[model samples]
Each structure stands twice: as structure tokens, then as C-alpha cells.
Target: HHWGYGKHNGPEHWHKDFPIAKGERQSPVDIDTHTAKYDPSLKPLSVSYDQATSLRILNNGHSFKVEFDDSQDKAVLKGGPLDGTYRLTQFHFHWGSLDGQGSEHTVDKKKYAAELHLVHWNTKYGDAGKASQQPDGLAVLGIFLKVGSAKPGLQKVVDVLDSIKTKGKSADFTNFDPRGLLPESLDYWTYPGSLTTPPLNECVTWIVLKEPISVSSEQVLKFRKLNFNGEGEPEELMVDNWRPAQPLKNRQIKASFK
Candidate 1:
């Protein structure tokens, strides 16, 4: 059966196909700020995004993602816990059917309405697939979304959701910048972790923003309009598409601010 957020093929059953699902440094961990140590050595994150690099928006049977042209270092992330510049590849969101809970990573067991992941890859590895197999090869920027005032930055993405309402659907989406979606503070928690999805590679250097952007409940509901099934398959609403917090094991989460 395909891996999805369902009773049978959900996060609980992922280990069957992806054995590393239960690995030590698995991601989306509960960020206990009290336990996270402040690291003075960590530098402020630097982001340079080229709005024209945006390619298209697509629904891939899981979450809708806005892909970018990462062939070069046009849009990049530098500083922070990263060793070198990582090119931005794509960005996606995870949310629940209702507004109560949905985020993958929690803060002191506190869940948010949704979560956004901006995926990047280390240049030394050439491609994202190869980069995911090595430690310190992938860096993911996590931003939590709370239900409140409408976020103008997020509205652009939501406006296109109707076009890609079903799995395998896609549309040309360009000249959009992802930088606008970030919160005012770059303060974050960094740690070694794995992908929350299947293949579950332990290659990510997690940078979770301490600040969360706000979006209206109605805008979040638009995401639920998407279907997990393709055109011919039975319609299954896409909701609660988030992995639970995994074990922290021997990792130490470091914070950029006190």
C-alpha cells in the first residue's frame, strides 16, 4: 500500500518500507526550549531568493509543493548551522483537516495549525537525491503556521491550490518569492534530523524558526480541498498530512538566541 496519512499506511506503518523511520535522529521532534542550549557560535541565517526561479506548483499525492530552479545557487541559504551554501529546491506545507493541530514539529508539545518546509541541498553532492544519502547534505527550514490574521505572503500559494486540487495535478507558477512567508525573527533551533517522509534519510540539518507566521482558518481550509487520489481514483481529502514527533535520542538541540 502507498504511504499516506491514513489508518493503514500512516506514520505508524512507515517503518515497514523505510526501516530508518525508527532511526536515532528522526525529525519533527518536540522542541523543548528549556533544554535547548544557546549557541553563540551560530551565525544569523542569510537568505537570498530569486523570485523568477519559481517553476511550478504541483500536488504529488501527498502535499502540494512549489518547486524552484535549483540548477544553480540562485536562491540559497547560508550561515546558521550550515557548513556551506545550500540551494533551495522546493517548499511545501503540512496541515490538518481542522485548525486544532497539524504541525509536524511541536514546541513543548504544543502543536500549530500547519507547518512549512523549505528543502535545500548541499552543493558538494551535486543532486538532492545523492545529497540526502549523506549526513550534513540536506538542510530544511521549518516554519510553523498559526491560525489568526490572514497572511498576505501565504495567500499567493493558496490562490493556486484550486488549480492543483487533485494528486498528480500541476500548474505553471512563477515569479513568486518564498522569503515573504518567513516570520520577522530568524531565531531558530538547530539539530541533526531525518526527513519526516518515507526514505526517511538522516541527512537534514534542521533549522526551525522560533517565530510563527499567522494565517486565517479559512485560508488553511483551502488546502483541505485537495485530494490525495488521482483523477480516476476514489476521492480522499488531503488532511492531517504530517508526521508525528520522533525520538530525540543522542542529539542536542541548539538555539540561536537565549
Candidate 2:
């Protein structure tokens, strides 16, 4: 009866409850590198985060999310397609059933191994729920994950997957810096889009990085081992949690770097 990635309740059926599922500016759209226009007016991204805001991690039946304390301006994202400072609320990952595919966003129609979404909300609205209702109220930093060398910084997150293997499970995870999970290059593609999940509010200003962070195959396997179901429910592996690419329609993707 719940929304899930199962054949009966997956993305295709999300429109039933959240009608904007087929919205014009849906997220996870395939970014055509050649078509993306370079915009010199785009500002460089700036991130300032405090260690105190790095709170606990939770397995919310769909994905493992590391939430941050956003009551204050402790951790924030500025510039880069954003009008004002956006508070860092949380971050999560999306992956697939196999090694080759799983990322929500793609480049030139090519899918990656995984994708990391750093979710932020506008400070102008003073609240997330209200801000989400307005266009350009949310900004998400999307980073692709490629399988290759081992990413040491990610090991800290991967190690905790086991502790929060089942849904509704949570554990204390503090003092972790999310910047370490990003690629060296800050170059990215910007666009107007919606949340990849349900209640697809078309208020996101997507900042998708041009480069990918490397992750070992073993490290990626750790995520697959996670249990999507709760202790009393039928066990299902937490793999292929990514949504397929949506249509670009009339929207244009702006590039921050040439």
C-alpha cells in the first residue's frame, strides 16, 4: 500500500498520488552535453558547513539519508544557480541493481553507477515546506558516482549502511563533512527541475557536477546489502533505487564552466 520501487508501486505509479509526476520540469533529466549552454553570468559555488550540524543518519525505507540541523545558518550553499543562501537540510544517494547503471541523472544519455543528491532549501522562505511550493525555492547539488578507485571518504558512510540496514533504523553519525564526498571539479550543469521523489514540486534549481567521484565495487556492494523492508516485512535488497530519466521538454540546461 506504500510507495516503493517495486514493479507495482514504482515511479510509473507515483503520479496517482502526486499528479506533478509528469510535470514539465521533472528532475533526473538526461543532460545533453552538446546542447547545454555556457553561461558566464553563473556564479561560483560556495559552501560553508559547521561540524555541529552533521547529525544522525536514517534508513527511511527508500534510501539512507544523513540529516543536518538546519534551524540556523550553520551549513549553507550559495551562488551557482541559487539566488540566496540555501540551508543544508540533508543528503542521500541513489543506486541500481547492478554495477553499470543506477544514477538518477545522466550525461549525453549515459547512466552512471550512482548519484548523490545534496538537498538544500531557501532561507528566504524561512521554511522548507513553504519554500518548496514556490519555483526556485530548492537547490540540489547532484554528483555522479563512477566505479573505479576506492573513495576513502565514502567508506565512513558505507560502514554505517549495515547498522541502518532495515527501514526505520537510525544511528548517530556526527562531525562528518559532506564536501569530502564531492568531486574535485566544481563545474556543473544548472536547470530548473523538481524533486526526484513524490510530491514532485517543481521548485528545484539543479546543480549537477560535471565530474564524478570514484567508488570501489566493494564499497558500492555495501549499499546493495541494505534491507529495504522493515524487520516485520518481507526483505528486499536496497538496490536500483534510482528513478529513470524524465523528459527535458522546453527547458534549457545552463553550464557553469566552458
> Clashing pairs in model 2?
96-240
- Per-model clash counts, in order, read 0, 1
lDDT of 1 by residue, 142-206 (tens): 99999999988888889989999998899999988897898999999999999999889999999
Poorly placed runs, candidate 2 (over 4 Å): 50-52
Least accurate 10 contiguous residues by lDDT in model 1: 45-54
Per-residue C-alpha lDDT of model 2 across residues 91-150, encoded as one tens digit per residue: 999998887799999998899999999999999999889889989789999999999999
Per-candidate Cα lDDT values, in order, are: 0.92, 0.91
Candidate 2: residue 142 lDDT (0-100): 93
For model 2 the local lDDT of residue 34 reads: 96
Best by lDDT: 1
- Model 1: residues with Cα > 4 Å off, grouped in runs: none
